[model samples]
Target: GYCAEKGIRCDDIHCCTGLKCKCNASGYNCVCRKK
Candidate 1:
């Protein structure tokens, strides 16, 4: 799991790959990279 040191904003941040996933102020809810 990955954690952001500083707080992340949902609107300001985007998915790692622009895939379908849940994104929130805390962080994203999808895998950053696919295997």
Candidate 2:
């Protein structure tokens, strides 16, 4: 599978290659982040 870009919505943590899937600032859906 391809990696998701930063800020892109993600359902799983594994969706990102070097990044991570975490809740956005709004505390709503998850998104790929560099932190």
Candidate 3:
């Protein structure tokens, strides 16, 4: 039952509830973001 908010670290593309996992501007890792 893990959930993440926008800008938070994320691995699962669907982990961010209504949001989604997207690559950060830094391109280091993916984070939850608005869809």
Candidate 4:
């Protein structure tokens, strides 16, 4: 739905919650950042 043709998971969390979107080492998904 997001990420153009693809998207990151953290983009959702950052949008839903108040967290930052971080790219994991795997370079596939995303993770939330600390406050």
Model 4 lDDT tens row, 1-35: 23322233664444334445667677755655543
TM-scores for every candidate against the unseen true structure:
0.19, 0.49, 0.49, 0.30
| lDDT at 23, model 3 | 79
Over 4 Å off in model 2, which ranges?
A: 24-27
**Model 3, residue pairs in steric clash:** none
In lDDT terms, which candidate is top?
2
Residue 21, candidate 2: C-alpha displacement in angstroms: 0.3
Clashing residue pairs, candidate 1? Answer: none
Give residue 26's error in model 4 in angstroms.
Answer: 6.8
Output the lDDT of residue 26, model 4: 77
Assess candidate 3 and give its TM-score to the true structure. Answer: 0.49
Per-residue lDDT of 1-35 in model 3, one digit per residue for the tens? Answer: 65777777776435556777877578767876677
Model 2, position 4: C-alpha lDDT score: 78
| Candidate 3 lDDT score relative to the true structure | 0.69
Candidate 3 — which residues are off by over 4 angstroms?
A: 12-14, 24-29
